[PDB]
Assembly symmetry: D2
Homo-oligomer: 155 residues x 4
């Protein structure tokens, strides 16, 4: 592993992803060149340090996902759920009732009737909130389906 | 311990507290009559059940604080930090920078220069947010002080 | 959906799994008959209640995995990581150094040189501990390989 | 603020405390000279770095407590609960039943009848485990009392 600050390109990929949902509140990222490019949210100090000193991933901050080239030969940032804690959430989310929220955390899809609020602006992937506004996972909207309207991806 | 649904009075005390900060998103509470009255956020089903069946505190839901009579012989709800996860936060909070946020979680007060945003409407106790908008504790505003502008109460 | 206490057979499937690793410390389980049989660790009181009163999964306790029929037409309990918190761990585990432990939590396999201790007794799946003895995930031992000796399954 | 590796003396104060309970599994600590000396468990890499580069507390690792001079003018390390995650626990602990464990996490003392196991070797402060062997807090043994045999200190 080489560990470095994120490239301008990589930041844009990370930003593109965050901006599907809202405002990216966190500025500083490092990349761990492994098999794939792992993205860490780092504090400003670590971001500064990493210029002069290689640091191991366990000293960096928070792993928030990976950059890979997808099927279409398009580089994408693939966030983990932790990445979403960096976002002031504004859109492409659904709020589920408490029962459905709970079930969602067990890997269950959510039915449409369980959706209390949806603010959807296009994204396939939506942030799934429980009824307390907390992120419980990421879901795949299934615009046509009812029982499985929000397909469980991550929880 | 008798375990019961919260009284209308007790709900009002709980609501009074939540409404210093925003909208109480959670409706159902039980009270565990111990030495003091412990408040649990319970789901609707448990709230319904508790009518017919005593349940032990470990089956109820989330302990969110205690009702006691304060110094002025005034009954107050004393929330724990968990109570605040029930509130759509709107006011009486401060947002700290990441460095100060971190230190706050170690029990440190926050200086005024660390305050990135304050939406204060009167309360002595403010919700302290980190720079990601997450609740890191409760603070006592010290309107006149600088180094200890937000006194650490809970984190 | 039907929620009931776990059958004798289901308890054996659960116990079989726990006993690969150690002593199952938790006695009481319920099953939620959904698409698949989901297993909840419940407290004794809930286990008692669920006799006379249906409860919803969000009132039950802790989701710990699912019973399904595998490829061999053999019923198996598939634990999630939370299940392992119910086990006094004794065997089929590895302990990783801190660097490898951290990386494991990011979905990385662990190399053999990272294994500080292994107490392996046959199981494909091993509990992966960090250097503090805390469960960080489950891994697939690849006895013959070096770079990917512990294949990451869950973390 | 000055951030440095822990002194030999400070390491002894930390080790003294850990060794009341078992084996300190973590070797590397830094100290943040604030109002008091705050102790951070840091990884080896950070411990190495902190030689040549000041880092802020938010980059260090895990805050585990504070060194202060007590009433007897004796320097002591005061751990927080997180410190105990660094210890292979061997002694000065009690194990509580699940009901009492839960109540303990709400700040309640534990009665003697709730103690399932006690391995006590002298310490006023005992690690309190739940019935799954997980640390739920620290308690003050009140050898002579029954209702409040384990006084709740931290949970």
């Amino acid at each position: 592993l080489r560990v470095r600050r994120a490239s301008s390109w990589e930041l844009d990929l990370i930003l593109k992803e965050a901006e599907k949902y809202g405002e990216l509140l966190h500025e500083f990222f490092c990349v761990v060149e492994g098999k794939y490019r792992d993205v860490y949210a780092v504090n400003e100090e670590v971001w500064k340090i990493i210029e002069d000193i290689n640091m191991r991933p366990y000293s960096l901050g928070t792993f928030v996902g990976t950059i890979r080239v997808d099927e279409n030969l398009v580089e994408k940032f693939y966030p983990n759920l932790e990445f979403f804690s960096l976002i002031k959430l504004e859109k492409n989310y659904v709020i589920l009732g408490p029962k459905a929220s709970f079930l969602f955390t067990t890997g269950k899809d959510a039915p449409k009737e369980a959706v209390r609020e949806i603010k959807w602006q296009g994204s396939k992937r939506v942030v799934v909130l429980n009824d307390l506004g907390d992120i419980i996972g990421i879901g795949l909207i299934n615009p046509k389906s009812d029982r499985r309207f929000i397909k469980n991806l991550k929880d």
